[PDB]
Design a protein around this ligand. Structure first.
Ligand SMILES: Nc1nc2c(ncn2[C@H]2C[C@H](O)[C@@H](COP(=O)(O)NP(=O)(O)OP(=O)(O)O)O2)c(=O)[nH]1
Ligand SMILES: [Mg+2]
Ligand SMILES: [Mg+2]
Length: 430
DNA sequence: ATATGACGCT
DNA sequence: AGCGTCAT
């Protein structure tokens, strides 16, 4: 009881842009705003692959990884914006720059960890302490939380969605202990006040809307964030966890969406995250290893200790392209030409990076995929990255993979290459 | 015929 | 180092 830690030590948020690439294209082109809209890359094969979908288009069943031609069957009036294409490949620069807009705003409030192109974790523990002293045990008004849901509420003894939201919020606020600066629920609440402010600033200054989760750790914040998308934020308290997890499929928790999660379900014969509480830590460790077992034992209780890393910038800078089916690269001159296209984009991005961020990459990782192999990568090799020069980088990349060629013929490259990937890594200050 | 980026294992 | 996992 009195010595059992409860993982209520931090206030952590996860901010995620709503249909991000779509919002970027909608800001630029007002004709797309408030429409069923999707963002696709390429266009020839079945109209392009969809990678972002507006909430209006989602209502018709349009999803990520759908071909545009297929999406149009679900949604005849679907509007499309295409990813820029440069040097014969998708060029994501517009979205990366839009991401930086958002991240720089977030960074004004607190330490952020860039988690993807459109989301960041925020460690609000300090900011919350500040704001709490700033306040004089002053009650928190529901007016400070106009887009916040409290997960699990309302409960106990309206038919509108906004109605429910306020009911739950009222119940939450009516029960808060505002004179105890160390109440975790109070700290979460103040955290949510700050995230309202953050989300307001992002929208005012960029035009982009986002959702957020506020809880005591990254996993719960990320889970919370998805509970009430779009344009809303969700507070998941420590106390909400038993009911929330009691029907929560294991695959919904970050890192359990793949094979480990499947084995948890398979080996233990369970479905829901809460069902994990019935196993001892040693049991879980026996099945899934020391780290995973410990992590699971704590997580199913709502406890997780992964820190918000102070890192706003990506650690690697890479470019890749798939060459599916018949388009697989079959000749030496083909492989070289595409390595060059990749290396030229990489040079551009690295030079920009060196100027903006005062660092230089020192290692170049070269990765390929051969026809027949259904892995992400067939093979990875590194070499020194000593100069930001596309021709040198592409020549080096070729050198470290040219032995993979099975062909005896000068011209030919067998087996044909279905993917090329160049990645700059191991940065140093500059 | 579905462009990236972080991290763990050995 | 090079491979595998998980993710957006
Ligand atoms: N090239 C490529 N881009 C992708 C992929 N997946 C996502 N992107 C891009 C496109 C996404 O816009 C962006 C953010 O990824 P999310 O946060 O998972 N989804 P979104 O923000 O669209 O909607 P919401 O969060 O409201 O559910 O990352 C992919 O598989 N490939
Ligand atoms: Mg998003
Ligand atoms: Mg995201």
């Amino acid at each position: 009881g009195p010595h059992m830690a409860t993982g209520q030590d931090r206030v952590v948020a996860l901010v995620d842009m709503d249909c991000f690439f779509v919002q970027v294209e909608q800001r630029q082109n007002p004709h797309l705003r408030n429409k069923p809209c999707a963002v696709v890359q390429y266009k020839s094969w079945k109209g392009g692959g969809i990678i972002a979908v507006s909430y209006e288009a989602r209502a018709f069943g349009v999803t990520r990884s759908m071909w545009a031609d297929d999406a149009k069957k679900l949604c005849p009036d679907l509007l499309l914006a295409q990813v820029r294409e440069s040097r014969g490949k998708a060029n994501l620069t517009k979205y990366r720059e839009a991401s930086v807009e958002v991240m720089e705003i977030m960074s004004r409030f607190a330490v952020i960890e860039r988690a993807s192109i459109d989301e960041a974790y925020v460690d609000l523990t300090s900011a919350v302490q500040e704001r709490l002293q700033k306040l004089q045990g002053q009650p928190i008004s529901a007016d400070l939380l106009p887009s916040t849901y409290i997960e699990g509420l309302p409960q106990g003894p309206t038919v509108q969605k906004e109605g429910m939201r306020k009911q739950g919020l009222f119940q939450w606020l009516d029960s808060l202990q505002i004179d105890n600066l160390t109440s975790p629920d109070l700290q979460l609440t103040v955290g949510a006040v700050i995230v309202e402010e953050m989300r307001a600033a992002i929208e005012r200054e960029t035009g982009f809307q986002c959702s957020a989760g506020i809880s005591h750790n990254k996993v719960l914040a990320k889970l919370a964030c998805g509970l009430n998308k779009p344009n809303r934020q969700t507070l998941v308290s420590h106390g909400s966890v038993p009911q929330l997890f009691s029907q929560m499929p294991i695959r919904k928790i970050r890192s359990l969406g793949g094979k480990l999660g499947a084995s948890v379900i398979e080996i233990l014969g369970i479905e829901y995250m809460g069902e994990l509480t019935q196993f001892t830590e040693s049991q879980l460790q026996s099945h899934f290893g020391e780290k995973n077992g410990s992590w699971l034992y704590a997580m199913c209780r709502g406890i997780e200790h992964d820190p918000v890393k102070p890192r706003q910038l990506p650690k690697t800078i890479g470019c890749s392209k798939n060459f599916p089916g018949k388009t697989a690269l079959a000749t030496r001159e083909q492989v070289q030409w595409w390595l060059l296209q990749l290396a030229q984009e990489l040079e551009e991005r690295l030079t920009k990076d060196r100027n903006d961020n005062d660092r230089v990459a020192t290692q170049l990782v070269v990765s390929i995929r051969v026809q027949g192999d259904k892995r992400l990568s067939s093979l990875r090799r590194c070499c020194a990255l000593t100069r930001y020069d596309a021709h040198k980088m592409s020549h080096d990349a070729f050198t470290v993979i040219k032995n993979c060629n099975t062909s005896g013929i000068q011209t030919e490259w067998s087996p044909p290459l279905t993917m090329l990937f160049l990645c700059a890594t191991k940065f140093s200050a500059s």
